[PDB]
Paper text:
An affordable 3D-printed, X-ray-compatible microfluidic device (3D-MiXD) is reported that allows data to be collected from protein microcrystals in a 3D flow with very high hit and indexing rates, while keeping the sample consumption low. By designing a microfluidic chip capable of centering protein microcrystals in a stable 3D liquid flow, serial synchrotron crystallographic data sets could be collected with low sample consumptions and fast collection times.
Protocols for the microcrystallization of ADC were developed in-house and are fully described in Section 2. The two different proteins microcrystallize from significantly different precipitant mixtures: PEG 6000 with NaCl for lysozyme and ammonium sulfate for ADC. Seven ADC data sets were collected at distances varying between 0 and 6 mm from the flow-focusing cross. At a constant 10:1 flow-focusing ratio between the buffer and the crystalline slurry and at a total flow rate of 550 µl h−1, this 6 mm distance is equivalent to 2.14 s of sample-travel time from the start of the flow-focusing region. The overall indexable hit rate for all ADC data sets was very high, varying between 13 and 40% of all X-ray ‘on’ images. Two final experiments were run to further elucidate the performance of these devices. Firstly, a further ADC data set was collected 3 mm downstream of the flow-focusing region [position E in Fig. 3(b)] at a buffer:sample flow-focusing ratio of 5:1, with a correlated decrease in the overall flow rate to 300 µl h−1 (compared with the previous 10:1 ratio and 550 µl h−1). The indexable hit rate did not increase under these conditions, showing that the number of hits is mostly defined by the sample concentration rather than the flow-focusing ratio or the speed of the sample inside the chip (up to 5 mm s−1). The overall X-ray dose (diffraction-weighted) was calculated with RADDOSE3D to be 74 kGy for ADC and 55 kGy for lysozyme. As expected, there was no evidence of radiation damage to the proteins during this room-temperature data collection, with both proteins showing intact disulfide bonds and carboxylate-containing side chains.
Residue numbers in the entry:
A (entry chain E): 25 to 115
B (entry chain B): 25 to 123
C (entry chain D): 0 to 24
D (entry chain A): -1 to 24
Amino acid sequence: XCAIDQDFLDAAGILENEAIDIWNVTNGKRFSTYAIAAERGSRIISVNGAAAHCASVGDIVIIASFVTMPDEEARTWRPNVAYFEGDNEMK
Amino acid sequence: XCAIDQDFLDAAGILENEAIDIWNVTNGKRFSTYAIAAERGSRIISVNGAAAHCASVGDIVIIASFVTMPDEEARTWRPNVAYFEGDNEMKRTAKAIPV
Amino acid sequence: SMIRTMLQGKLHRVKVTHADLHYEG
Amino acid sequence: GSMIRTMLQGKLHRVKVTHADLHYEG
């Protein structure tokens, strides 16, 4: 794979080559792949390879990454969330 | 399961008995299993056991392994990638491949 | 000693713009 | 540095399946 505008990756703290989960709001499919950077300002979300069987152009998706840490740190942890509308315009 | 030519395991940095993900480009199935080494130079990719319900002879697949490491190491990490064409002929680069 | 799996980050309701079965990278 | 990431270690890109055996013992 999933190529993502590098500005989107920066806002959510997702790294190139990191494991990501994709949850498709349109068709209900759920799968795991890895992140590749697309050009900054492109607003691209591209599903490449085998993943093209789980999403079509125009599907709405949620993309998430997970990390591990000790219980004591987890209690106050705050995730990085980015919100979108229209043609992949970041609020 | 999945038995893989030991040369291919070495090029990708995958160990015998390591967890692997298989993504089937031909039929879209996605599953997790573990790697077994086949004889060096055999060019075998063999799906054994329950995994034989998810792939067939001739299907095109992607085989991946994932590791954990701290954030500072993750930011400079580069994965080990091998590319294939024809009779499971391995290349270091995507340049030579038709499509 | 006990290690948790926590949400690191998410992109909420992005649209798929391209889909390529034949990718090589 | 205690926050741990899950990263792609390596991949075999578009290898072809050569054998499939439901009845394996190993």
